[PDB]
Amino acid sequence: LRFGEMERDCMIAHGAASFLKERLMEASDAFRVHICGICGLMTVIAKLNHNQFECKGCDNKIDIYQIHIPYAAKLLFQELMAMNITPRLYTDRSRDF
Amino acid sequence: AGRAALYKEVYNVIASDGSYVNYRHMALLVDVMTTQGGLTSVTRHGFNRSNTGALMRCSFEETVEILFEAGASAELDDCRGVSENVILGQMAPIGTGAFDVMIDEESLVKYM
Amino acid sequence: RLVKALEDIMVHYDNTTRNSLGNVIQFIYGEDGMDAAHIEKQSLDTIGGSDAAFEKRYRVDLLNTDHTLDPSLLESGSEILGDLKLQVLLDEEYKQLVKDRKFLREVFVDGEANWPLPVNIRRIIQNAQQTFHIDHTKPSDLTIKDIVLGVKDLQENLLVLRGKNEIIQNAQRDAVTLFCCLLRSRLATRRVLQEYRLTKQAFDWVLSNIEAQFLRSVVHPGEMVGVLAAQSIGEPATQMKVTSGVPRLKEILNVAKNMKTPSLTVY
Amino acid sequence: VGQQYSSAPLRTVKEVQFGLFSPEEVRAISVAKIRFPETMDETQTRAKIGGLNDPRLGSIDRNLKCQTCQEGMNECPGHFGHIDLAKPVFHVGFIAKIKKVCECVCMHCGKLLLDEHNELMRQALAIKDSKKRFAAIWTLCKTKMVCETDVPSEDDPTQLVSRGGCGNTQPTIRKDGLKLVGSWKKDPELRVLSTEEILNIFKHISVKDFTSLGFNEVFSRPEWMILTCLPVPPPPVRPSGEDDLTFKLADILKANISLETLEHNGAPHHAIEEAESLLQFHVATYMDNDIAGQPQALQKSGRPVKSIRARLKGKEGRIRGNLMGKRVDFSARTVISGDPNLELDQVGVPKSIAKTLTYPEVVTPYNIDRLTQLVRNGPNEHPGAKYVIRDSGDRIDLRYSKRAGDIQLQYGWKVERHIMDNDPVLFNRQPSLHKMSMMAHRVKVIPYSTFRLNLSVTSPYNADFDGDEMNLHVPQSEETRAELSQLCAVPLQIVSPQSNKPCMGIVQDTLCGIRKLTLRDTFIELDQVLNMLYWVPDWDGVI
Amino acid sequence: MFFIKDLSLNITLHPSFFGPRMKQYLKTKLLEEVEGSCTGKFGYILCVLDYDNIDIQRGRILPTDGSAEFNVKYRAVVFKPFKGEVVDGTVVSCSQHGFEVQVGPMKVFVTKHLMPQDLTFNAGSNPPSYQSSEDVITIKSRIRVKIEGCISQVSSIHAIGSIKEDYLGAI
Amino acid sequence: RRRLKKVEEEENAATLQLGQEFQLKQINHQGEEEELIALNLSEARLVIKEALVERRRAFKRSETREKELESIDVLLEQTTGGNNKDLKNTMQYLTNFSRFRDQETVGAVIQLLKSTGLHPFEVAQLGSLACDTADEAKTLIPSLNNKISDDELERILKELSNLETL
Amino acid sequence: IFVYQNNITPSAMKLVPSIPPATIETFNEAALVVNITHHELVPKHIRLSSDEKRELLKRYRLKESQLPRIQRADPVALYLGLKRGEVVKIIRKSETSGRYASYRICM
Amino acid sequence: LKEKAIPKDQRATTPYMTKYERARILGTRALQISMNAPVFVDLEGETDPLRIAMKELAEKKIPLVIRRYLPDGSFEDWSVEELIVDL
DNA sequence: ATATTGTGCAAAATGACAAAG
RNA sequence: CUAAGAGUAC
DNA sequence: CTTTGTCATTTTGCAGGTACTCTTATTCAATAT
Ligand SMILES: [Mg+2]
Ligand SMILES: [Zn+2]
Ligand SMILES: [Zn+2]
Ligand SMILES: [Zn+2]
């Protein structure tokens, strides 16, 4: 069943954030992807069985993080990259609120 | 005075058919519309032009143009809006997400 | 469009209303800090009526006979007459009521007396009357000083903003001014001793219930009031000489340079 | 089974930093240089090396692991390649921006036209937000048509101070399709501004100049608005009958090879120019096929090609169609019926739906017995269980499992079992114009094929029983369950914030009935009084 | 050289472990992961100072998971070699390509290119050694060496030392 | 800042470029800035022993080279558990090349080097290396060039050599 | 304050900003015939001192941009002679609570 | 963190637990109980983790603290024990 | 004999253009 | 499988 | 001589939410290996 935009709006108005996250991630599509702390791109080669992570270009192997994002979000970021845009994802703040 | 007149017009529209809406909702609407010093329309030309985060702005209208402008201008999205966390699939900072639940080890020991 | 415009508006832990950027939309939610679900329509008694009717309803004089009080109303009803300090208390209370009358007549120019306010005082008074078995004939156990000081303490206890500086205190007073006007209009000395005939324990119970209900009527931080307002405005629109209804709503939200019926009102 | 364990630290995204790809960054992140327009080799059974489906970009076959990461199609995100373009081309999305930028900067010396010496320039540069800075700078410098090698002094307009200006005359720039034509003032000389010269002039813009213009030194420089290395999205982005993106990439490679051969072998300038324009057109339509004026790049079947911008915009784009709202699991939908014998917060659930939708309950000493009983009951009878998930992530399907014998549950395991009575469930009717049109109900399993709900709760849902359908969502965790029961429950919604009054009431038959019951004429005899008293569940038992 | 620095580590605790001995579990799990460890960013990590009160802070329940993410801050004694720094050590092994000197927890490989020409390898000696006109370098022999090249790997720091400069060699 | 990529001058002790996180000032866990302190071999050994004996006391409530080596081995076994190979090698190296015995001498050394107002890295190197003459110290430590007068360095090395015991 | 009859020549407008701290303000008589601030729609505007602005920002934890804005061409702002960065406190008759105090920063 | 944390002596937020706070506390505690966390209360036969969490909240035996974030990034720590549950 | 290639708002932005100094 | 179109329910 | 405000054009982006069923169609034809 489609969980449309205004259903999301009703859940927001109810204030149930965890249920909204559960609907949009565990109930539809949860994808674990790897990024590096230097460039926020998903261009990390991850060999999980060998336990080896490496971002070519940045030339790093310990500044890696894993994030759970919707697979549609990963596809969107890859389509942005293919269209010459860098949606760098960072796991810490660089500015104050 | 513009904000007061705007509230009066919205209230007249709502009460034309005899319906009643609490004051605070229309007050919030007109306050948002006039918070920038002028009349900010509820349109792609209005509220969507405020520097409030590219990801949430693109979810409304002119999506790809917004992404292109954000890339060219190297905008930083701090992921405070609801749409940003919806897109990233993490608990938005709203309702039950407007705080952090932590652990009081001292209290935990104190209980036994 | 409305939902998208207002989606990020939230009430924060300092009771301000802010968007995703932290910009302040309202320094206190709804200009009173109250949850809409806890608001009920009630009448402001001071604003209405005539000056003579207002005096008869509220004025209490311990030194004359035109606006005296029946000694049977309260236990010490024959000793308070001729006193000075209690007359001072009544004088300041009546002066405050007159000031509230003027203030409300300034706020509501048309004189409308029924407005939505958080705590329903009438229901509390009825509950106390039916709970403590007020017989309406026995002299009241209350003392005038008890009434006045209890009302003042209750006003001090209606906290919306918890800060500890001049700005926050002034904002708190501005937040509770109208509800305090209502409270003084209802829990006046004359009304308490004559119309309602509360007792000491009943009066204390009324004060505690008013305080608890007012504290329970405060909006909760984290409430997504923007989405709520957008939906509360948009849902009636679906049910829907001068343009009105949905076309006029469109003319308003889309701030249109040219509108179909530009009319001007001259007094 | 999900995704196997990863040792990388788990964090949440805090900031999204936008920008543009530098060509050297494109080359650094790429894992393969795409050169051949074909996808499969001559054998038609494998992917051609160096082609558009290079196994280093990710495996197009479920049976083969990715050649780069050695992970299945379940794990491999896909890895970008890169096409090294023969000549620079404009990015279709930035063309106007590029025009504005080149209209703000000298086309010969690559310096901003009006330095701080100019009067309005201090006001323009004092602006804080980058967009308004750029707008002011552009509306100030667009009408300046000379580099002004020498300007009157800021102190007074008597002496002349020479800036680093070449003194040439800037042209008036227009766009004719995918290219920019500049007309220099006749001493007009009209000529197409080559993308190479514009790229060169952008590379000569000083750091201060383009950071005043609103660009970033590290994340987006103006010369990165010119394409010289196209990133190649992996097969995940264009899965296969090839995708439209694959065909457009093949066309881009064909045009690139044609231009490169025409340059290598020499040719008249006309042929080189035509090949360049073809490459520009292909690259542009690969990103935005809805360019005003130009004709849409049709597909082999004669239909317009689906560009990436088409994949992102619209109600069915990625954002609105897949991110702001998406199809979900553990949901049901069916026709609704009224039931005066159901509580206000109860919802009647068909037995088949209750047997389909499931909840994962963690095995605990407090629920070992009943969970074991449900597992014994199996998935074909209600109440029962449908799956058993072990602590290792392995999933046991209760169908085909009774052959292996009774399962001995252990604490920490999960039993994915049929939804039973009093399970909180979100109940929704569309269009769902307000929060009351989506409320939490308690499950009551009933033996018919319709959702059943109290008559009083139909008003907030705006629901009838003339064929209306409603949707049901099952929370899958204790947190979501709890906040559904404690925030969205029907009783908590009785008084609406919309107009500070209750939104549910007595309606329809009961309303009529109550008016008939409370008339002064109405009197009831002893037997009917006893019946009516017993019909009240909480009646204290005194007549 | 030996320093002490302010380090932090993010540990995650399962719901099962939240008992009165939670502080003990956090402190022990900081150990067995940082004690005796090696990182390229800060060198070797040998021990943790100030064990009596290590700043564990509050912890943070991860939503949808229930595990708590503590950010334990502590003081750790580290040994970070640096380029061009003289330090003492002991030889433990020798070979054709060079010889290894034990400095603290690390082994520094001085290559055969980075000794005076008079010093030459000798495999005839048991154990094999490096012999010159005036001195011989054997197993368990004190020697001072200057580090001139460091490659910073994470689980194994590698450094290059030399004795070509004046007053470098056996003590 | 969040600069993608990074350009850095190569680390070089002689240039005193110890690293962006090895600067002179470090923000402590309390939020204030403190000088980047460096431990000489004897001082580091004493600090390690103090920490380990404190840990042993906490667990309980909850000189000559051979005897010292045996005692540190027994205490190391009692206090911590496994993965102490690096720690053991460091501890035995410290006991072998320890320039001082007890707290008083290392305190005197650190205050004497403090009196110089010199860089912590340089004073730690001076206290660690058992140098003899002055030009020898300068060639051992290029960072000391054009920082301290020759006579002062030679004399302080003389008192340090005097403070050497066993 | 310069009060003119019909208009100002634009060549006179450019020299209106003189050497600071002196400021020149132009008003048209036709725009001054009616005092706009007596309209019941116009609430009470009170300019804040720098100390008051600092206290406000401190107490509400705000930045300059996080306050509601008032344009430096608004008729009330021109009436009070507001300048950029100055904050006006607005006192309003509210129908939920008797009095409501807002603040607007001149931009 | 030191600058972000507002000292306990001058917290200016409401002392009453909000509805969202109560919902999330009950959800988190129920989830932890469901994952075999220790229970700090006596059980009268209740088996649902959610109602176990409710019983724990009724007598203030939940060892959690809310970190209420202010719009500027500062925060106040309120123990569940001291928050008043009136709603 | 078969693969390969020849729509209607309505706001915003922009351009043309008679008056003004 | 994909795409387009048509009809339809509230 | 250049502004300057001003109209008349050009863009140009959008157009409720869910849900069901069925039908057709996937470049035609000429050329060369
Ligand atoms: Mg119907
Ligand atoms: Zn990287
Ligand atoms: Zn791969
Ligand atoms: Zn130039």
Output the CA torsion C156→C162→C167→C169 (10° steps): 0
Structure tokens at B107: 């209290």
Tell me the residue ranges of DSSP E strands in H19-71. 64-69
Give the Å distance between the CA of B59 and the centre of ligand 2: 27
Give the Å distance between the CA of E85 and the centre of ligand 1: 85
Same domain for D150 and D23, yes or no, is no
D315 Cβ under 8 Å from any chain A Cβ: no
Give the Å distance between the CA of A61 and the centre of ligand 2: 10
Structural domain ending residue among the three candidates E52, E84, E116:
E84
- Count of CB atoms within 10 A of residue F132's CB? 13
Tallying the residues shown for chain B, one arrives at: 112
Contacts with G67 from chain C: Cβ below 8 Å: 23-24
Number of helices (H), then strands (E), belonging to chain A: the values are: 3, 6
Same domain for D394 and D337, yes or no, is no
**DSSP type of residue G37:** G
Residue A36's H or E segment, with its range, is strand A31-36
Same domain for E77 and E89, yes or no, is no
Structural domain ending residue among the three candidates E56, E84, E112:
E84
Within its chain, how far is the Cα of B68 from the centroid? 22
Contacts with G43 from chain B: Cβ below 8 Å: 4
Q: Give the C-alpha separation, G25 to C193, whole Å.
A: 62
Q: In angstroms, what separates the C-alpha of B37 from chain C's closest C-alpha?
A: 12
Residue C247, amino acid: P
Q: What is the CA radius of gyration of chain C?
A: 23
- Count of CB atoms within 10 A of residue D274's CB? 15
SS (H, E, C) chain F: CCCCCCCCCCCECCCCECCCCCCCEEECCCCCEEECCEECHHHHHHHHHHHHHHHHHHHHHCCCHHHHHHHHHHHHHHHCCCCCHHHHHHHHHHHHCCCCCCHHHHHHHHHHHHHCCCCHHHHHHHHHCCCCCHHHHHHHCHHHCCCCCHHHHHHHHHHHHHHCCC
> Which residue in B has a C-alpha nearest to residue E13's C-alpha?
B103
What is the count of structural domains for chain E? 2
This entry's atomic model was obtained through: cryo-EM
Q: Is the CB of C257 under 7 A from strand I?
A: yes
- Shortest CA distance to C9 belongs to which of C21, C19, C23, C24? C19
Residues 17 through 56 of chain A touching chain F, CB cutoff 8 Å: 38-39
Residue C94's H or E segment, with its range, is helix C85-107
Output the CA torsion E81→E87→E88→E89 (10° steps): 30
Contacts with C230 from chain B: Cβ below 8 Å: 29
Q: In angstroms, what separates the C-alpha of D17 from chain F's closest C-alpha?
A: 10
Residue A23 lies in a domain: yes
Structural domain ending residue among the three candidates E84, E119, E138:
E84
Structure tokens at F106: 């290392």
A81 Cβ under 8 Å from any chain B Cβ: no
What CATH number does residue D393 fall under?
3.30.1490.180
Burial-class residue B39 by CB neighbours within 10 Å (0-12, 13-18, 19+): middle
Q: Within 7 A of a protein CB, which nucleotides of strand I?
A: 10-12, 21
Taking the CA of residue E118 and the C1' sugar atom of nucleotide I9, their distance in angstroms comes to: 94
Q: What are phi and psi for residue D434, nearest 5 degrees?
A: -155, 165
Max CA-CA distance within chain A? 46
Mutate to test the interface with E, among F10, F18, F90 (most CBs of E within 10 A): F90
Give the HSE-up count for residue F133: Cα atoms under 13 Å, Cβ half-sphere.
4
Which residues have CB under 8 Å from D423's CB, separation 6+?
D359, D442, D443, D474, D481
Q: What are phi and psi for residue B65, nearest 5 degrees?
A: -60, -40
Quote the domain boundaries for residue E65.
1-84
Taking the CA of residue D282 and the C1' sugar atom of nucleotide K25, their distance in angstroms comes to: 27
Residue A97 lies in a domain: no
Q: Give the C-alpha separation, H64 to H56, whole Å.
A: 11
Q: Give the C-alpha separation, D295 to D302, whole Å.
A: 13
Fold of F39-62+64-166: Growth Hormone; Chain: A; (1.20.1250)
Same domain for D84 and D119, yes or no, is no
- Count of CB atoms within 10 A of residue D139's CB? 13
Contacts with E58 from chain H: Cβ below 8 Å: 65, 67, 77
CA angle C172, C174, C178 (to 5 degrees): 115
Give the Å distance between the CA of E97 and the centre of ligand 3: 40
User: Which chains have at least 3 CB atom pairs separated by less than 8 Å from chain D?
Assistant: A, B, C, E, F, H
Q: Within 7 A of a protein CB, which nucleotides of strand K?
A: 3-5, 11-19, 26-28
User: In whole angstroms, how far apart are CA E6 and each of D302, E34, E49, E78?
Assistant: 66, 13, 10, 10
Structure tokens at D9: 């630290």
User: Which residues of D line the annotated binding site?
Assistant: 66, 69, 76, 79, 106, 109, 147, 166, 464, 466, 468
Same domain for E3 and E77, yes or no, is yes
Same domain for E123 and E154, yes or no, is yes
Quote the domain boundaries for residue D99.
89-239
Q: Is B70 strand, coil or helix?
A: helix
Domain boundaries, given as residue ranges, for chain H: 1-87
Task: Say yes or no for a CB contact (<8 Å) between D9 and E10.
Answer: yes
| Residues facing G87 on adjacent strands | G105
Q: In angstroms, what separates the C-alpha of D218 from chain F's closest C-alpha?
A: 7
Is A10 among the annotated ligand-binding positions? no
- Shortest CA distance to D75 belongs to which of D2, D9, D11? D2
Residues D255, D278: contact at Cβ < 8 Å? Answer: yes
Q: Give the C-alpha separation, D378 to D367, whole Å.
A: 17
| Helices F65-79 and F85-96: angle between axes, nearest 10 degrees | 160
Q: What are phi and psi for residue F65, nearest 5 degrees?
A: -65, -40
Give the Å distance between the CA of D506 and the centre of ligand 1: 19
Quote the domain boundaries for residue A23.
1-85
Structure tokens at A1: 């069943």
**Smallest CA–C1' separation from D174, nucleotide:** I14
E135-139 long-range contacts (CB < 8 A, ≥24 apart) are E135/E169, E135/E170, E137/E91, E137/E94, E137/E99, E137/E169, E137/E170, E138/E91, E138/E94, E139/E91, E139/E92, E139/E93, E139/E94
Contacts with F5 from chain A: Cβ below 8 Å: 38-39, 58
Residue G10's H or E segment, with its range, is helix G10-13
Q: Is C5 strand, coil or helix?
A: helix
Residue A96 lies in a domain: no
Q: Give the C-alpha separation, A45 to A52, whole Å.
A: 8
Residue B107's H or E segment, with its range, is helix B105-111
What is the count of structural domains for chain A? 1
Tell me the residue ranges of DSSP E strands in D331-413. 331-338, 346-350, 358-362, 385-389, 395-397
Q: Write the class of the CATH domain H1-87.
A: alpha beta
Q: Residue E64: which of A22, A61, A62 has the nearest Cβ? A: A22
Q: Give the C-alpha separation, B110 to B103, whole Å.
A: 13
Burial-class residue D353 by CB neighbours within 10 Å (0-12, 13-18, 19+): buried
Q: In angstroms, what separates the C-alpha of E50 from chain F's closest C-alpha?
A: 7
Task: Say yes or no for a CB contact (<8 Å) between A15 and B92.
Answer: no
- Shortest CA distance to D409 belongs to which of D381, D374, D382? D374
C7 Cβ under 8 Å from any chain A Cβ: yes
Residue D92, amino acid: V
Residue C51's H or E segment, with its range, is helix C51-58
Same domain for D164 and D226, yes or no, is yes
Taking the CA of residue C22 and the C1' sugar atom of nucleotide K26, their distance in angstroms comes to: 53
Q: Is G69 strand, coil or helix?
A: strand
Residues G40, G48: contact at Cβ < 8 Å? Answer: no
Give the Å distance between the CA of A47 and the centre of ligand 3: 9
Burial-class residue E146 by CB neighbours within 10 Å (0-12, 13-18, 19+): buried
